[PDB]
């Protein structure tokens, strides 16, 4: 029983990961009300 174990600090093992993508590209967020979502684009070419 006579052990006297003295505990010191621990580690974290934190990760090298940051978004960089929702933080630079996908910056604006949109919730959904429907199940599907379209993505239309207008191709314009006058003459």
């Amino acid at each position: 029983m006579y052990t006297t174990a003295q505990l010191l600090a621990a580690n974290e093992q934190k990760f090298k990961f940051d978004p960089l993508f929702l933080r630079l590209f996908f910056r604006e967020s949109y919730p959904f009300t429907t199940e599907k979502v379209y993505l239309s684009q207008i191709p314009g070419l006058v003459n």
Partner: protein, 49 residues
């Protein structure tokens, strides 16, 4: 999820068409400048003219 009447759709078509015609004018306008300071000559020739 949010439609409109064909009337405001007609308004949208009118505004878009005005935009397209203005763009076509601005674009065809540079043709003469390109001919002028590209050769010193220009040709104003095309059908219905």
């Amino acid at each position: 999820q949010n439609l409109a009447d064909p009337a405001y759709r007609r308004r949208r078509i009118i505004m878009q068409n005005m935009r397209d015609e203005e763009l076509a004018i601005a674009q065809v306008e540079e043709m003469q400048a390109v001919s002028a300071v590209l050769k010193g000559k220009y040709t104003m020739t095309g059908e219905a003219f």
